C-alpha cells in the first residue's frame, strides 16, 4: 500500500530518508514528506511504481526539466533522483524516486485561510509566478509548462511562491499546417482532451482547424486565467463552456474598482489568437511598471500569507 509506506527508510545516494507523511495522492505516484537521518533536512519525495514506459519516460523527462530550471527563486529546487530496474526492485515494479525541497504548502491552502486580497498581494503572487514561467521560456530549447494553475503554485518556507509540477511540460511546438490531414487533426484533439481538463483548455487546442500555433503562448492564456482568479475568486471559464473559450467570451466584473489596474493585463492575456497575446517578457515589464508606480517590491516575501 502507498499509505503503508510511511515509516519506511529510503536510501537515495548518500541520503537515508525517513518517510514521515503523505503530502499528495496522485493515484500513480504519491508524494511523501521525508527527513534525512544524517542531517535532519526535510524534503518532498515523489515515488513512482510503474511498468508502463510512457509514465517512465515522462518522469525521466520531468527530472531533466527540473535540473535545467534549478537555482531559480520561483521554481522548486531539485535535490536528487534515482530509478530502480524492474528486475532489481522489491515488488517487481519499476521504482522511480524524485526528491525536491519541501515547501510550506499549496497557495490555494493559504488563500482561503485568509476580506479579499489587496492589489499588492495579487501583484507579488502573480509577478513571482510569471518570473518562473519567464525562466522556463528563456531556456534553449524553451520549456512550456502546459499545466499552469493555482494548484501547482506552492508557498515556500521563506514566504515566496514556488512553481512545482513539471510532469506535463514539453519542448516541442506544434504548428497546424496545410499539410495536416483531416484525421491528423482528429487524432491530435483526442490526445489532448484525454490529457487535459475542460476548464483549463485553450482556444488553440479546442479548434484544430484554426491553424493557431500550439506552443509557448499556451502558458500566457493560463496566466491570464490565474490573474482573473486571484482578483475575482473564480476561474473565468470555470463551467467549462468550450463555446466561450474558443470565442474568448468572458466577463470582467462591471463595477470593480479595486482591481482596476489589472484590467489591461487580463484582456491582453486572454486573446483568442495566440499571436495577439503578450509575450512573457511583455507581461513582466508591465508588472514591473505597476510595481514601480505603486512603491512595491514584487519579489519581496508575501507576509500576508504566512
Amino acid at each position: 500500500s502507498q499509505s503503508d509506506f510511511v515509516g519506511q527508510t529510503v536510501e537515495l545516494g548518500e541520503l537515508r530518508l525517513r518517510v514521515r507523511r503523505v503530502l499528495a495522492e496522485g493515484g500513480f505516484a504519491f508524494v511523501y514528506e521525508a527527513q534525512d537521518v544524517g542531517s535532519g533536512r526535510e524534503y518532498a519525495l515523489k515515488r513512482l511504481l510503474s511498468n508502463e514506459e510512457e509514465k517512465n519516460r515522462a518522469i525521466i523527462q520531468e527530472v531533466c526539466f527540473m535540473k535545467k530550471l534549478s537555482g531559480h527563486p520561483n521554481i522548486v529546487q531539485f535535490c536528487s533522483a534515482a530509478s530502480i530496474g524492474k528486475e532489481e526492485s522489491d515488488t517487481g515494479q519499476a521504482e522511480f524516486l524524485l526528491l525536491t525541497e519541501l515547501c510550506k504548502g499549496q497557495l490555494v491552502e493559504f488563500l482561503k485561510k485568509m476580506g479579499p486580497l489587496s492589489c499588492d498581494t495579487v501583484l507579488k503572487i502573480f509577478y513571482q509566478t510569471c518570473r518562473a514561467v519567464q525562466h522556463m521560456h528563456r531556456q534553449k530549447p524553451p520549456i512550456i509548462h502546459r499545466d499552469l494553475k493555482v494548484e501547482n503554485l506552492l508557498l515556500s518556507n521563506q514566504g515566496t511562491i514556488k512553481l512545482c509540477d513539471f510532469g506535463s511540460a514539453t519542448t516541442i511546438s506544434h504548428y497546424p499546417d496545410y499539410s495536416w490531414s483531416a484525421q491528423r487533426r482528429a487524432l491530435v484533439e483526442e490526445e489532448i482532451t484525454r490529457n487535459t481538463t475542460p476548464m483549463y483548455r485553450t482556444p488553440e487546442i479546442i479548434d484544430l482547424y484554426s491553424n493557431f500555433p500550439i506552443g509557448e503562448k499556451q502558458d500566457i492564456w493560463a496566466l491570464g486565467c490565474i490573474l482573473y482568479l486571484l482578483c475575482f475568486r473564480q476561474h473565468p471559464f470555470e463551467d467549462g463552456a468550450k463555446l466561450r473559450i474558443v470565442n474568448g467570451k468572458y466577463s470582467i466584473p462591471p463595477h470593480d474598482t479595486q482591481y482596476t489596474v489589472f484590467h489591461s493585463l487580463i484582456r491582453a492575456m486572454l486573446q483568442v489568437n495566440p499571436e495577439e497575446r503578450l509575450s512573457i517578457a511583455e507581461v513582466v515589464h508591465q508588472l514591473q511598471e505597476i510595481a514601480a508606480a505603486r512603491n512595491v517590491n514584487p519579489k519581496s516575501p508575501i507576509t500576508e500569507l504566512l
Binding site: Q35, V37, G38, S39, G40, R41, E42, Y43, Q77, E101, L102, C103, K104, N157, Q158, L306
Partner: protein, 124 residues
C-alpha cells in the same frame, strides 16, 4: 490542537562562556515530534540551529555550532534542552524551540509561535 511551547534560560552571557536553554511542551505528543532549536539573529532573520530525533537516535546541528552545542530531550517531562558552550558574538539572537526540522539552507519548517528567550553574548 493547541500548541504551547515555552522557552527560558537565556540572558546576558560573555564571549567564550556557556548557557543552558530549556523548553516545555503541551497540547501535542512530544514523543512523536522531531524537535529543533531555531534562532532569530538581528539583521539576518530566522535560521535553524540544532535538532534531535523523536527517540534521540540522531542529533543534528548547523555547521557554525557543531562541536560547541549539544541538544537533548526528556520525553517523560516533555522537555527540550540546549547546552551552549564557547559562545561567540554570532550566537546572539532570540531562541525558540519548534516541531519538525528544516529545508534547504537551514530554513526552518515551523515558524515560531512562542515568545522565545533572549541570548546576548556581550563583554559587559
Amino acid at each position: 490542537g493547541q500548541v504551547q511551547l515555552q522557552e527560558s534560560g537565556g540572558g546576558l552571557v560573555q564571549p567564550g562562556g556557556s548557557l543552558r536553554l530549556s523548553c516545555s511542551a503541551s497540547g501535542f505528543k512530544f514523543n512523536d515530534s522531531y524537535m529543533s532549536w531555531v534562532r532569530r539573529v538581528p539583521g539576518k532573520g530566522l535560521e535553524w540551529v540544532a535538532g534531535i530525533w523523536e527517540d534521540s537516535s540522531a542529533a543534528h546541528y548547523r555547521d557554525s555550532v557543531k562541536g560547541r552545542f549539544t541538544i537533548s530531550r526528556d520525553n517523560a517531562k516533555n522537555m527540550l534542552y540546549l547546552q551552549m558552550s564557547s559562545l561567540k558574538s554570532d550566537d546572539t539572537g532570540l531562541y525558540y524551540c519548534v516541531r519538525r526540522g528544516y529545508s534547504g539552507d537551514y530554513r526552518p519548517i515551523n515558524n515560531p509561535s512562542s515568545q522565545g528567550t533572549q541570548v546576548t553574548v556581550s563583554s559587559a
